[PDB]
Design a protein around this ligand. Structure first.
Ligand SMILES: [Ba+2]
Ligand SMILES: [Ba+2]
Ligand SMILES: [Ba+2]
Ligand SMILES: [Ba+2]
Lengths: 153, 153
C-alpha cells in the first residue's frame, strides 16, 4: 500500500526504532531499560504504534504498548494508546515538521489508579528518536518521568 | 518464557486466528470483511491482542485494533483497547473455562462522537473462535453489529 497524504509528513517516523531509556521519579531511583518502538501504516490517515520494554541484563520483557497516531494538515494530532499496565490514553496535541516532533498531553486517562495527566513527546534529534514521558499523580506535579533514546533499524 | 498462572486458564486463545465477519446494523445493510486476530503473551499476567480487517477481494485494509487482556484467578477479566478509528475502550468482564468464553462490556469508550456502548464476546464454538460485537448509539439500543468466526491457524 502507499502513503496516504495525512501520514506522509511523518514518514521519517516510519520503521523500527531501538535503544534504551532511563526512568526516575521523586518517588523512585534511576532505573534503565531497553526499548523498541515501531511506527507503521496501511494507506490510512493513521499510524500504528507498538512498543515494548525489557530488563537490560536478562533482558526479560517489562512493559508494552500498542497505539494509533492520527495526524492532520493543520499540524494537530490525535493519539490513542493502550498499555499492558492497564491504562488507555487518548492524547491530543501537535506535530511540527521542521523540528520533526509530535507533542501530546493526555486528555483521558482511563482506568487510572493514581495517574492524572501524562504527556508524551516524540522528537527526531540528531537522527535518533528522543522519546519522553512526563507524569502527574494524585500527589506529584507534571514532571520528567522517563526519557528514552532510539536508533533506526 | 512461562504462561503466567493467572493466564494459563485462557491458553486456548494463544495464537493467530483468520476468518471473516459481517456487519449488519439498522443504518447499514449487510456487509462482509476479512479479519485476523492474534493473542500472544510474554510471561506476564496479560494476553496481548491484535486484530485487523480487510476487504475480501481487495483485500484492502479497513481497521485495526489492539490491546491487552488481564484475567484474574477469580473469573473477572478486564481488557484495554485502542482502535484505528481513533477510539479507546475499557472492557471489563468475566471469563469462563469450559464454556471457553470471554464476555466484555464497555466501562468507558473514550473519544466517541456517537457510540454509547460496546460489548465484545470471544468464545470458542465447536473449534472456531466466534467474535460477537454489539453496540448501542445515541439513537440505537445495544444490538448486534459484528459477527465473525475464525479458524485457529
Ligand atoms: Ba500546513
Ligand atoms: Ba529536532
Ligand atoms: Ba478459580
Ligand atoms: Ba463453548
Amino acid at each position: 500500500p502507499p502513503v496516504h497524504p495525512f501520514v506522509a509528513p511523518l514518514s521519517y517516523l516510519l520503521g523500527t526504532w531501538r535503544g534504551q531509556g532511563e526512568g526516575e521519579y521523586p518517588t523512585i531511583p534511576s532505573f534503565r531499560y531497553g526499548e523498541e518502538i515501531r511506527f507503521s501504516h496501511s494507506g490510512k490517515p493513521v499510524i500504528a504504534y507498538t512498543q515494548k520494554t525489557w530488563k537490560l541484563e536478562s533482558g526479560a520483557p517489562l512493559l508494552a504498548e500498542s497505539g494509533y497516531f492520527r495526524p492532520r494538515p493543520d499540524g494537530s494530532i490525535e493519539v490513542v494508546i493502550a498499555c499492558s499496565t492497564g491504562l488507555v490514553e487518548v492524547q491530543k496535541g501537535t506535530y511540527n515538521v521542521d523540528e520533526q516532533s509530535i507533542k501530546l498531553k493526555s486528555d483521558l486517562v482511563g482506568n487510572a489508579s493514581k495517574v492524572k495527566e501524562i504527556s508524551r513527546e516524540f522528537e527526531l534529534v540528531d537522527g535518533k528518536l528522543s522519546y519522553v514521558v512526563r507524569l502527574s499523580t494524585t500527589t506529584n506535579p507534571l514532571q520528567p518521568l522517563l526519557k528514552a533514546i532510539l536508533d533506526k533499524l
